[PDB]
Design an enzyme around this catalytic site. Structure first.
Site, mmCIF file in Angstrom:
data_model
loop_
_atom_site.group_PDB
_atom_site.id
_atom_site.type_symbol
_atom_site.label_atom_id
_atom_site.label_comp_id
_atom_site.label_asym_id
_atom_site.label_seq_id
_atom_site.Cartn_x
_atom_site.Cartn_y
_atom_site.Cartn_z
ATOM 1 N N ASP A 179 17.080 5.615 -58.378
ATOM 2 C CA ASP A 179 18.023 5.496 -57.272
ATOM 3 C C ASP A 179 17.242 5.008 -56.049
ATOM 4 O OD1 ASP A 179 20.540 5.557 -56.217
ATOM 5 O OD2 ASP A 179 20.681 7.718 -55.994
ATOM 6 N N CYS A 213 26.859 2.255 -60.630
ATOM 7 C CA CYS A 213 25.636 3.031 -60.571
ATOM 8 C C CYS A 213 26.167 4.360 -60.032
ATOM 9 C CB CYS A 213 24.569 2.392 -59.649
ATOM 10 S SG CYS A 213 25.129 1.696 -58.051
ATOM 11 N N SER A 214 25.512 4.994 -59.071
ATOM 12 C CA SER A 214 26.072 6.259 -58.590
ATOM 13 C C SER A 214 27.150 5.979 -57.540
ATOM 14 C CB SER A 214 24.983 7.162 -58.004
ATOM 15 O OG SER A 214 25.494 8.470 -57.788
ATOM 16 N N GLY A 216 27.851 2.733 -56.632
ATOM 17 C CA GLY A 216 28.401 1.428 -56.948
ATOM 18 C C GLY A 216 28.075 0.394 -55.886
ATOM 19 N N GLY A 218 24.138 -0.026 -54.458
ATOM 20 C CA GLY A 218 22.729 -0.413 -54.432
ATOM 21 C C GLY A 218 22.249 -1.150 -55.674
ATOM 22 N N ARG A 219 22.151 -0.419 -56.783
ATOM 23 C CA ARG A 219 21.731 -1.005 -58.048
ATOM 24 C C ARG A 219 22.800 -1.985 -58.526
ATOM 25 N NH1 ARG A 219 19.988 4.880 -60.445
ATOM 26 N NH2 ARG A 219 21.638 5.539 -58.985
ATOM 27 N N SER A 220 24.062 -1.563 -58.465
ATOM 28 C CA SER A 220 25.174 -2.419 -58.863
ATOM 29 C C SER A 220 25.134 -3.745 -58.090
ATOM 30 C CB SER A 220 26.504 -1.710 -58.581
ATOM 31 O OG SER A 220 26.679 -0.598 -59.433
ATOM 32 N N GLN A 260 20.849 -1.761 -51.299
ATOM 33 C CA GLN A 260 20.595 -0.640 -50.404
ATOM 34 C C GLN A 260 19.219 -0.486 -49.773
ATOM 35 O OE1 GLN A 260 22.753 2.538 -49.356
ATOM 36 N NE2 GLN A 260 23.723 0.532 -49.069
HETATM 37 O O1 LIG Z 1 19.908 2.274 -55.146
HETATM 38 C C1 LIG Z 1 21.014 2.805 -55.052
HETATM 39 C C2 LIG Z 1 21.418 3.756 -53.983
HETATM 40 C C3 LIG Z 1 22.504 4.647 -54.516
HETATM 41 C C4 LIG Z 1 23.389 5.330 -53.505
HETATM 42 C C5 LIG Z 1 23.904 4.583 -52.351
HETATM 43 C C6 LIG Z 1 24.767 5.261 -51.369
HETATM 44 C C7 LIG Z 1 25.103 6.684 -51.552
HETATM 45 C C8 LIG Z 1 25.980 7.384 -50.553
HETATM 46 C C9 LIG Z 1 25.255 8.534 -49.823
HETATM 47 N N1 LIG Z 1 26.272 9.295 -49.083
HETATM 48 S S1 LIG Z 1 25.909 10.902 -48.483
HETATM 49 O O2 LIG Z 1 27.464 11.582 -48.252
HETATM 50 O O3 LIG Z 1 24.964 11.681 -49.644
HETATM 51 C C10 LIG Z 1 25.012 10.638 -46.971
HETATM 52 C C11 LIG Z 1 23.544 10.634 -46.979
HETATM 53 C C12 LIG Z 1 22.806 10.411 -45.735
HETATM 54 C C13 LIG Z 1 23.535 10.190 -44.488
HETATM 55 C C14 LIG Z 1 25.002 10.194 -44.487
HETATM 56 F F1 LIG Z 1 25.724 9.967 -43.255
HETATM 57 C C15 LIG Z 1 25.736 10.419 -45.728
HETATM 58 C C16 LIG Z 1 24.231 7.912 -48.870
HETATM 59 N N2 LIG Z 1 24.750 7.328 -47.692
HETATM 60 C C17 LIG Z 1 23.594 6.740 -47.009
HETATM 61 C C18 LIG Z 1 23.849 5.222 -46.902
HETATM 62 C C19 LIG Z 1 25.046 4.907 -46.022
HETATM 63 C C20 LIG Z 1 25.830 3.651 -46.371
HETATM 64 C C21 LIG Z 1 25.313 2.330 -45.983
HETATM 65 C C22 LIG Z 1 26.080 1.120 -46.297
HETATM 66 C C23 LIG Z 1 27.363 1.228 -47.000
HETATM 67 C C24 LIG Z 1 27.883 2.548 -47.394
HETATM 68 C C25 LIG Z 1 27.117 3.760 -47.080
HETATM 69 C C26 LIG Z 1 22.394 7.048 -47.891
HETATM 70 N N3 LIG Z 1 22.830 7.847 -49.057
HETATM 71 C C27 LIG Z 1 24.586 7.417 -52.703
HETATM 72 C C28 LIG Z 1 23.728 6.741 -53.680
HETATM 73 S S2 LIG Z 1 23.433 3.616 -55.666
HETATM 74 O O4 LIG Z 1 23.884 4.720 -56.851
HETATM 75 O O5 LIG Z 1 24.697 2.962 -54.767
HETATM 76 N N4 LIG Z 1 21.962 2.591 -55.965
#
Ligand SMILES: O=C1C[C@@H](c2ccc(C[C@H](NS(=O)(=O)c3cccc(F)c3)C3=N[C@H](CCc4ccccc4)CN3)cc2)S(=O)(=O)N1
Ligand SMILES: [Mg+2]
EC number: 3.1.3.48
Length: 297
Positions: A179, A213-214, A216, A218-220, A260
């Protein structure tokens, strides 16, 4: 294309390039995604599908699924990018697969990564223990699986219990893509991608392939950006014309946050640059990627 890559590396400007993409990315409403009744259908509160491009379930009740149709017009390929299904949206997930006539599902994450659930177990792990998603009247059976060292390809039989029609769905599961990380090498990534291509699952005769992906995004996003760019290089008169940053921005018009980290952006360049070799004719690079990926470990 490798000249821009080379100058970015020399400039040490991947973070700046990447943030410019984040700042110029489209911003469209996601009102349906944010309705109170759809809160438990979303895995992360900050990752939602834009209203204009979301996939709609054909059910009267609630047609919402966190999924987006990424339609690339010039490249002539559509993809459905969705989050990893939740325990309560696995039915919806397969209802979408059915309704959109998808033939392949590309999974780029594992159900549990570094001790955290990232996606529900939405397909059967054992032949003898099929799955029934009641709310949708669909049956899903594991027919067989070809397990490789870093990825598994599975044959599933999805059945519409109502009409009894059955369809074979191919499952392409990359099991070693961390991830917020990148594949082990362009070779193992491309070896995987061309396996999906060769299967016919991406043919314009079928519905959009479903990638997830998780979240949908970053990896996707990395997977689709690379595929789209290679498709574009093979289509145009001058393959050196493909502007990856421009292509990523076009895709971001369909779903927020594709790609991402700056390093996933950089990996995309490498994957495309390396993949260009097969597209230009080189008939031995594919065997090379296979060897390099050590799939038969
Ligand atoms: O390499 C990857 C990254 C994963 C990924 C991306 C995003 C999230 C969402 C997560 N939300 S949260 O409620 O745990 C969370 C965590 C930290 C701060 C916050 F305000 C909310 C997440 N959001 C930010 C990224 C924000 C974002 C940026 C751009 C578009 C949409 C969202 C970083 N991780 C989870 C996993 S993937 O499965 O899409 N592939
Ligand atoms: Mg068994």
């Amino acid at each position: 294309m490798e000249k821009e890559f080379e100058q970015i590396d020399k400039s040490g400007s991947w973070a700046a390039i990447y943030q410019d993409i984040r700042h110029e990315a489209s911003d469209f409403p996601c009102r349906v995604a944010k309705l109170p009744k759809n809160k438990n259908r979303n895995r992360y509160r900050d990752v939602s599908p834009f209203d204009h491009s979301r996939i709609k379930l054909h059910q009267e009740d609630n047609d919402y699924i966190n999924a987006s149709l990424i339609k690339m017009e010039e490249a002539q390929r559509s993809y459905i990018l969705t989050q990893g299904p939740l325990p309560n949206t696995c039915g919806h997930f397969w209802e979408m697969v059915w309704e959109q006539k998808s033939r392949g599902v590309v999974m780029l994450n594992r159900v549990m990564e570094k001790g955290s659930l990232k996606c529900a177990q939405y397909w059967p792990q054992k032949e003898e223990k099929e799955m029934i998603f009641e709310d949708t009247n669909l049956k899903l059976t594991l027919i067989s699986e070809d397990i490789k060292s870093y990825y598994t390809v599975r044959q599933l039989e999805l059945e519409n219990l109502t009409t009894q029609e059955t369809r074979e769905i191919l499952h392409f599961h990359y099991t070693t893509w961390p991830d917020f990380g990148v594949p082990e090498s362009p070779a193992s990534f491309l070896n995987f991608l061309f396996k999906v291509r060769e299967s016919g699952s991406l043919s314009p005769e079928h519905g959009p392939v479903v990638v997830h992906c998780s979240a949908g995004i970053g990896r996707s996003g990395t997977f689709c950006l690379a595929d789209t760019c290679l498709l574009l290089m093979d289509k145009r008169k001058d393959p050196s014309s493909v502007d990856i940053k421009k292509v990523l921005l076009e895709m971001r018009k369909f779903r927020m946050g594709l790609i991402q980290t700056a390093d996933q952006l950089r990996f995309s360049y490498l994957a495309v640059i390396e993949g260009a070799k097969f597209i230009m004719g080189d008939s031995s690079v594919q065997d090379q990627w296979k060897e390099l990926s050590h799939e038969d470990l």
